[PDB]
Write an enzyme that holds these catalytic residues in place. Structure first.
Site, PDB file in Angstrom:
ATOM      1  N   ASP A  52     -45.172  34.554  66.819  1.00 28.37           N
ATOM      2  CA  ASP A  52     -44.278  35.125  65.899  1.00 28.37           C
ATOM      3  C   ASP A  52     -42.808  34.397  65.930  1.00 28.37           C
ATOM      4  O   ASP A  52     -42.183  34.713  67.137  1.00 28.37           O
ATOM      5  CB  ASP A  52     -44.112  36.614  66.262  1.00 28.37           C
ATOM      6  CG  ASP A  52     -43.105  37.329  65.229  1.00 28.37           C
ATOM      7  OD1 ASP A  52     -42.553  36.512  64.272  1.00 28.37           O
ATOM      8  OD2 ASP A  52     -43.023  38.439  65.738  1.00 28.37           O
ATOM      9  N   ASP A 108     -38.996  43.040  63.497  1.00 29.95           N
ATOM     10  CA  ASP A 108     -38.840  41.858  64.431  1.00 29.95           C
ATOM     11  C   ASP A 108     -38.781  42.550  65.715  1.00 29.95           C
ATOM     12  O   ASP A 108     -37.691  42.383  66.661  1.00 29.95           O
ATOM     13  CB  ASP A 108     -37.407  41.113  64.129  1.00 29.95           C
ATOM     14  CG  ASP A 108     -37.503  40.217  62.865  1.00 29.95           C
ATOM     15  OD1 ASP A 108     -38.527  40.072  62.552  1.00 29.95           O
ATOM     16  OD2 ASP A 108     -36.250  39.608  62.713  1.00 29.95           O
ATOM     17  N   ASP A 119     -25.734  36.309  73.725  1.00 29.06           N
ATOM     18  CA  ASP A 119     -26.241  35.366  72.715  1.00 29.06           C
ATOM     19  C   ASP A 119     -24.864  35.130  71.748  1.00 29.06           C
ATOM     20  O   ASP A 119     -25.344  34.288  70.859  1.00 29.06           O
ATOM     21  CB  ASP A 119     -27.217  35.938  71.650  1.00 29.06           C
ATOM     22  CG  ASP A 119     -27.039  37.484  71.605  1.00 29.06           C
ATOM     23  OD1 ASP A 119     -26.006  37.934  71.862  1.00 29.06           O
ATOM     24  OD2 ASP A 119     -27.854  38.128  70.764  1.00 29.06           O
ATOM     25  N   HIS A 157     -30.581  47.952  69.065  1.00 28.77           N
ATOM     26  CA  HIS A 157     -30.882  47.979  67.854  1.00 28.77           C
ATOM     27  C   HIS A 157     -31.865  49.375  67.689  1.00 28.77           C
ATOM     28  O   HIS A 157     -32.035  49.612  66.490  1.00 28.77           O
ATOM     29  CB  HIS A 157     -31.543  46.696  67.502  1.00 28.77           C
ATOM     30  CG  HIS A 157     -30.843  45.492  67.395  1.00 28.77           C
ATOM     31  ND1 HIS A 157     -29.479  45.617  66.678  1.00 28.77           N
ATOM     32  CD2 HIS A 157     -31.011  44.267  67.832  1.00 28.77           C
ATOM     33  CE1 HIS A 157     -29.023  44.283  66.664  1.00 28.77           C
ATOM     34  NE2 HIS A 157     -29.898  43.426  67.361  1.00 28.77           N
ATOM     35  N   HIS A 169     -25.377  40.247  67.714  1.00 34.54           N
ATOM     36  CA  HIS A 169     -25.904  41.020  66.582  1.00 34.54           C
ATOM     37  C   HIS A 169     -25.342  42.428  66.434  1.00 34.54           C
ATOM     38  O   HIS A 169     -24.540  42.824  67.873  1.00 34.54           O
ATOM     39  CB  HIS A 169     -27.275  41.445  66.871  1.00 34.54           C
ATOM     40  CG  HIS A 169     -28.272  40.029  67.077  1.00 34.54           C
ATOM     41  ND1 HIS A 169     -28.269  39.325  68.053  1.00 34.54           N
ATOM     42  CD2 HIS A 169     -28.882  39.310  65.753  1.00 34.54           C
ATOM     43  CE1 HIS A 169     -29.000  38.270  67.851  1.00 34.54           C
ATOM     44  NE2 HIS A 169     -29.386  38.268  66.455  1.00 34.54           N
ATOM     45  N   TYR A 211     -30.122  34.011  74.838  1.00 37.14           N
ATOM     46  CA  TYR A 211     -31.332  33.483  74.641  1.00 37.14           C
ATOM     47  C   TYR A 211     -31.531  32.043  75.197  1.00 37.14           C
ATOM     48  O   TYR A 211     -32.488  31.415  75.204  1.00 37.14           O
ATOM     49  CB  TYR A 211     -32.132  33.587  73.134  1.00 37.14           C
ATOM     50  CG  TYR A 211     -31.988  34.972  72.968  1.00 37.14           C
ATOM     51  CD1 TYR A 211     -33.156  35.731  73.270  1.00 37.14           C
ATOM     52  CD2 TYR A 211     -31.155  35.483  72.248  1.00 37.14           C
ATOM     53  CE1 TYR A 211     -32.899  37.299  72.954  1.00 37.14           C
ATOM     54  CE2 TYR A 211     -31.022  36.917  71.922  1.00 37.14           C
ATOM     55  CZ  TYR A 211     -32.067  37.664  72.068  1.00 37.14           C
ATOM     56  OH  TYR A 211     -32.129  39.033  71.699  1.00 37.14           O
ATOM     57  N   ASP A 228     -22.558  41.664  72.074  1.00 39.42           N
ATOM     58  CA  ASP A 228     -23.686  41.014  71.548  1.00 39.42           C
ATOM     59  C   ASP A 228     -23.568  40.330  70.249  1.00 39.42           C
ATOM     60  O   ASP A 228     -22.683  40.877  69.381  1.00 39.42           O
ATOM     61  CB  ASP A 228     -24.936  41.927  71.594  1.00 39.42           C
ATOM     62  CG  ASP A 228     -26.202  41.194  71.289  1.00 39.42           C
ATOM     63  OD1 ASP A 228     -26.994  40.951  72.246  1.00 39.42           O
ATOM     64  OD2 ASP A 228     -26.496  40.997  69.878  1.00 39.42           O
TER      65      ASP A 228
HETATM   66  C1  LIG Z   1     -30.443  42.585  71.823  1.00 38.43           C
HETATM   67  C2  LIG Z   1     -30.314  41.735  70.548  1.00 38.43           C
HETATM   68  O1  LIG Z   1     -29.100  41.972  69.785  1.00 38.43           O
HETATM   69  O2  LIG Z   1     -30.101  40.334  71.106  1.00 38.43           O
HETATM   70  C3  LIG Z   1     -31.588  41.598  69.874  1.00 38.43           C
HETATM   71  C4  LIG Z   1     -31.663  40.197  68.748  1.00 38.43           C
HETATM   72  C5  LIG Z   1     -32.561  40.916  67.533  1.00 38.43           C
HETATM   73  C6  LIG Z   1     -33.049  39.510  66.723  1.00 38.43           C
HETATM   74  C7  LIG Z   1     -33.525  39.739  65.329  1.00 38.43           C
HETATM   75  N1  LIG Z   1     -34.637  38.736  64.796  1.00 38.43           N
HETATM   76  C8  LIG Z   1     -34.217  37.480  64.313  1.00 38.43           C
HETATM   77  C9  LIG Z   1     -35.359  36.413  64.250  1.00 38.43           C
HETATM   78  C10 LIG Z   1     -34.968  35.125  64.806  1.00 38.43           C
HETATM   79  N2  LIG Z   1     -35.920  34.086  64.323  1.00 38.43           N
HETATM   80  K   LIG Z   2     -22.298  43.652  68.653  1.00 40.12           K
HETATM   81 ZN   LIG Z   3     -28.105  39.958  70.110  1.00 45.95          ZN
END
Ligand SMILES: CC(O)(O)CCCCCNCCCN
Ligand SMILES: [K+]
Ligand SMILES: [Zn+2]
Ligand SMILES: [K+]
EC number: 3.5.1.48
Length: 638
Positions: free
Chosen positions: A22, A94, A267, A137, A176, A307, A174
């Site tokens: 994946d 995801d 990240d 999330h 995201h 990551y 973060d």
């Molecule tokens: C805790 C967090 O915010 O780092 C989680 C990140 C979610 C990633 C979403 N999927 C992205 C696909 C990458 N090809």
């Molecule tokens: K954030």
């Molecule tokens: Zn993140």
């Protein structure tokens, strides 16, 4: 009375992993946990932390932020095979499921609660939990973005119910957007949620319109949700610090939280494949440091993303370093934020202007792949050195110590006297010069002493010997409260002078920032706005090697001096020398306590006077072209 930092970790949370191909989830690996803890072990930080054990969050605790239907569905995943786990995972966005992920999710949630209890019971001052899976999330009835249960949402609700807290601050740095936290506290004014995130005009995951700056909350909670969208990649340390100085910190310090929870996703650091930002791991040493004066240091850091395994380990260590009180590393090359970041900062401040005092003046028009390894951070043998007047015994914390002028030092004071102060033989004033050189030699030449405080009687001779001795070694920031001129030359590029006085004096110099705060009840809110919005931005860009604080005897100052002393220790590796004119037992104890790294009492309750904000914004208009870190709007192009 609380001391120490808790490190909550358990290698069981690394015993679940993705079991099918994946490309969206391949980056969420158990090695993120093992690399992070091993890096803390390598740098000796884990050994200095209280290893509070991990527990499982009970069902009643999970129901605080999740529905019975969703909890029941996740509870059946341990009994599913690989095929059924694929079918269950594709019902969400995801996120993958493992036969052990439900077990780990309860551990990740329980670990966060263990950290909250350790901090709120005063068993530790702060702490960090290295958990997996992440949580910010996760929503009420859905797993999302590697998250099963919203760990940070648990902590805020848990601390609300079991401790009757009225104000909790959540800082999500973060890369995201933690939309699960935003949904959870959309209408709750008791939980302030701040989040910056890679947005790119909604083109980046999770591609939500409510991730934009216009979402300020709903109902009784509008104005307690703050989203800062990053619309371009490659954000730097200057962009992150501008976000803190001009958005988060001014809101956080007037909110006055009783507890700070950090959704610490790394990240957002350089080299990460998701964030694609350019901030060095050292920036998290200051992101942590600038928040620690809040809530008397009660800060619960909870791991989220991150990551790049190399960037993850370095950023974790810089966070725990600051949590333990170790000196902050110097940040060079700071300047203005980019145009895209200034636009996001501009729009957030505008939409939040109807909710917060620090932005109130904006509403009305009458008012307005490879990077170098971080250096080694080591706590001083003794952190603070105090010299009171002769024959004044004081009770010092374990981090402090008295002065003992050496023979080499005493010869230095003599040749300095036989050159600039030929007519000066008043013994004690002459001996104060020996203590200043003794403390400065121990601060700059070695890692034995970090900062110090010296009580003096004559200012002009004392500040001259202090500054000239430090210059003959690179760059000194001088923050002096009081009136009159001081023997400080700001003609070269080696000295910046911050002066807080009562009489207005036209600066006409770019290396000088004079703050004339009108005497009144709102002097506390006025000084805090100038500290976060003016003093700190120029100090960080200036990047001094030494901070020299000066307080004249004819010093209002008592309420804010502790916050400045703590925050300003982010500069110059924490090397700060404070000269107090005259003896004030309260001011010296407050200065030493902040210098030694102790927690500071909160300010509690407001809004400043419009004449002060008018004076401060005139200072920014006069300096932001030289010191770009002062900018909080997009610059006008010719
Ligand atoms: C805790 C967090 O915010 O780092 C989680 C990140 C979610 C990633 C979403 N999927 C992205 C696909 C990458 N090809
Ligand atoms: K954030
Ligand atoms: Zn993140
Ligand atoms: K909120």
């Amino acid at each position: 009375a609380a001391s120490g930092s808790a490190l909550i970790f358990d290698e069981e949370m690394s015993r679940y992993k993705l079991l099918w191909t994946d490309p969206a989830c391949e980056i969420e690996v158990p090695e993120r946990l093992t690399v992070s803890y091993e890096a803390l072990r390598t740098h000796g930080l884990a050994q200095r932390c209280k290893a509070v054990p991990v527990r499982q969050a009970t069902e009643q605790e999970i129901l605080l932020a999740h529905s019975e239907e969703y909890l029941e569905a996740v509870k059946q995943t341990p009994g599913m095979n690989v095929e059924e786990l694929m079918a269950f995972s594709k019902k969400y966005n995801d996120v993958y499921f493992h036969q052990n992920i439900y077990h780990c999710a309860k551990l990740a949630a329980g670990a966060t609660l263990q950290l909250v209890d350790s901090v709120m019971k005063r068993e530790v001052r702060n702490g960090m939990a290295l958990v997996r899976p992440p949580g910010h999330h996760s929503q009420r009835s859905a797993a999302n973005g590697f998250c099963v249960f919203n760990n940070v949402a648990f902590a805020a609700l848990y601390a609300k119910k079991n401790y009757n807290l009225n104000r909790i601050l959540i800082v999500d740095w973060d890369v995201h957007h933690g939309q699960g936290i935003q949904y959870c506290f959309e209408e709750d004014p008791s939980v302030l949620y701040f989040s910056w995130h890679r947005y790119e005009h909604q083109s980046f995951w999770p591609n939500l319109p409510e991730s934009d700056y216009s979402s300020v909350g709903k109902g009784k909670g509008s104005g307690f949700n703050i989203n800062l969208p990053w619309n371009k990649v490659g954000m730097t340390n200057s962009d992150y610090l501008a976000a803190f100085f001009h958005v988060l910190l001014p809101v956080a310090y007037e909110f006055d939280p009783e507890l700070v929870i950090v959704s610490a996703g790394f990240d957002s650091a350089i080299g990460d494949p998701e964030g694609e930002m350019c901030a060095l791991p050292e920036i998290f040493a200051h992101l942590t440091h600038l928040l620690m004066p809040l809530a008397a240091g009660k800060m619960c850091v909870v791991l989220e993303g991150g990551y790049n395994l190399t960037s993850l380990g370095q950023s974790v260590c810089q966070t725990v370093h600051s949590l333990l009180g170790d000196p902050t590393p110097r940040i060079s090359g700071l300047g203005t934020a980019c145009d895209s970041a200034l636009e996001s900062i501009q729009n957030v401040r505008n939409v939040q202007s109807s909710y917060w005092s620090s932005f109130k003046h904006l509403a009305q028009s009458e008012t307005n792949i490879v990077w170098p390894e971080p250096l080694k951070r080591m706590p001083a043998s003794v952190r603070t050195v105090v010299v009171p007047p002769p024959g004044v015994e004081l009770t010092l914390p374990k981090n402090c110590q008295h002065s003992d002028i050496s023979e080499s030092t005493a010869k230095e004071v003599q040749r300095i006297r036989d050159k600039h102060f030929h007519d000066l033989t008043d013994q004690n004033i002459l001996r104060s010069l020996g203590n200043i050189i003794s403390v400065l030699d121990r601060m700059m030449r070695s890692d034995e002493v970090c900062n110090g405080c010296v009580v003096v009687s004559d200012l002009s001779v004392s500040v001259q010997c202090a500054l000239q001795h430090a210059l003959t070694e690179e760059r000194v920031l001088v923050v002096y409260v009081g009136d009159g001129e001081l023997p400080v030359k700001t003609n070269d590029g080696k000295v910046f002078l911050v002066q807080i006085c009562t009489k207005e004096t036209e600066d006409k110099c770019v290396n000088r920032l004079t703050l004339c705060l009108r005497e009144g009840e709102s002097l506390t809110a006025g000084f805090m706005q100038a500290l976060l919005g003016l003093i700190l931005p120029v100090a960080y860009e200036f990047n001094p090697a030494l901070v020299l604080g000066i307080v004249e005897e004819t010093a209002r100052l008592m309420r804010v001096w502790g916050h400045m002393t703590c925050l300003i220790q982010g500069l110059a590796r924490g090397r700060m020398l404070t000269l107090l004119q005259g003896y004030d037992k309260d001011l010296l104890e407050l200065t030493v306590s902040a210098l030694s790294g102790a927690s500071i009492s909160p300010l509690g309750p407001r809004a400043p006077k419009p004449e002060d904000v008018e004076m401060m914004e005139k200072q920014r208009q006069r300096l932001q072209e030289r010191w770009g870190l002062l900018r909080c709007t997009v610059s006008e192009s010719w």
